[PDB]
């Protein structure tokens, strides 16, 4: 339907919701990359993701979502699903491939570890959270199986980070969109939410701290928590 009056696309617009402990694990992903690359962007706090105008941007009716001017300015582009928002930002703004990958060999590993998160840990974690908190009935056997699957995903990330010189998931030398996608679901606070001892994956914990010490990541976590708690509650932030 008709867009809100304050929704204008002069630059990349990242769509988020009010910052809470449970609302920021996916929206933080594109924000980390925007902060890493220093991309000019606006923040739009969505009051209701069920709103018809928003389903025209993201048919899956969730944040994060992006509206942006196409390189030639002929079209308004959109990105939705948190992994797709990372792919878009990398494609449009990371022309060096510092986070997207510079060659076929780099991208091969980046896309392996990015897709592993997109297909396995990400959806498993979101099904765990749904059945644990959101489902009207509690199904403990389903929850236990999903928690078990999370430990297997942590085992895989741990095995990778135990390989000689492998400081990051995809590339030995530097973090990539694979690392950004994985971090919010592979840190101590999220491990504790799942009822897991994160010290049981030492190389994964080290990696999460290494990622956490990055200035862009610190800025992203600060800002995503604050969205919708400033002077403006909903709509285009200033």
Q: Whole-angstrom Cα distance, residue 164 to residue 104?
A: 22
- Considering only 44, 88, 128, 198, the residue that binds a second copy (CB under 8 A) is 88
Instruction: Name the closest residue to Na ion (Cβ).
Output: 206
Task: Answer whether 84's CB lies under 8 Å from 33's CB.
Answer: no
Residue 118 binding partner per list a second copy, Na ion, Cl ion, none, with a CB distance cut-off of 5 to 8 Å that depends on partner kind: a second copy
Given a contact cutoff of 8 angstroms between Cβ atoms, the answer to whether 208 and 214 are in contact is: no
The count of other CB atoms within 10 Å of the CB of residue 148 is: 11
Indicate the helix (H) or strand (E) that contains 235.
strand 235-236
Q: How far is the CB of 144 from Cl ion (least distance, A)?
A: 8
Contact criterion met (CB below 8 Å) for 129 and 187:
no
Residue with tokens 């000019």: 40
Quick one: what does residue 70 bind among a second copy, Cl ion, Na ion, none, with the CB cut-off 5 to 8 Å set by partner type?
a second copy
> 60 vs 141, which CB is nearer to Cl ion?
141
Out of 6, 75, 192, 199, point to the residue binding a second copy (CB under 8 A). 75
Per CB under 8 A, the segment of 13-21, 40-48, 98-106, 214-222 that binds a second copy is 98-106
Q: Which stretch binds a second copy (CB under 8 A): 14-22, 131-139, 207-215, 228-236?
A: 131-139
Do 143 and 133 meet the contact criterion of CB atoms below 8 Å apart? no
Q: What is the largest CA-CA distance in the chain?
A: 54
Under rule CB under 8 A, residue 111 binds a second copy = yes
Which phi and psi angles does 79 have, rounded to 5°?
Answer: -135, 140
Binding site for a second copy (CB under 8 A): 59-60, 70-71, 75, 77-84, 87-88, 91-92, 103-105, 107-109, 111-112, 114-116, 118-120, 122-124, 127, 131, 135, 137, 139, 141-142, 145, 156, 159-160
């Amino acid at each position: 339907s008709e867009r809100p009056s304050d929704l204008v696309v002069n630059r990349l617009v990242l769509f988020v919701v009010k910052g809470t402990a449970t609302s920021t694990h996916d929206t933080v992903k594109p924000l980390i990359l925007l902060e890493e690359l220093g991309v000019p962007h606006d923040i739009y706090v969505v009051e209701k993701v069920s709103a018809p105008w928003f389903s025209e941007i993201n048919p899956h009716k969730m944040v994060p979502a992006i509206l942006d001017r196409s390189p030639d300015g002929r079209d308004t582009l959109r990105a939705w699903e948190s992994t797709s928002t990372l792919m878009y930002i990398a494609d449009a703004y990371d022309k060096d491939g510092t986070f997207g990958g510079r060659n076929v060999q780099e991208r091969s590993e980046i896309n392996n570890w990015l897709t592993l998160h997109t297909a396995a840990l990400g959806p498993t974690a979101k099904y765990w959270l749904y059945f644990y908190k959101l489902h009207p009935e509690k199904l403990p056997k389903t929850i236990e199986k999903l928690r078990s699957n999370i430990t297997v995903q942590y085992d895989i990330l741990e095995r990778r980070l135990n390989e000689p010189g492998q400081q990051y998931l995809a590339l030995k030398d530097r973090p990539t969109i694979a690392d950004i996608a994985t971090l919010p679901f592979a840190m101590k606070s999220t491990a504790e939410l799942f009822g897991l001892e994160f010290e049981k994956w030492p190389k994964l914990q080290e990696w999460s701290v290494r990622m956490g010490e990055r200035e862009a990541v610190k800025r992203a976590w600060q800002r995503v928590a604050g969205f919708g708690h400033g002077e403006k509650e909903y709509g285009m932030l200033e």
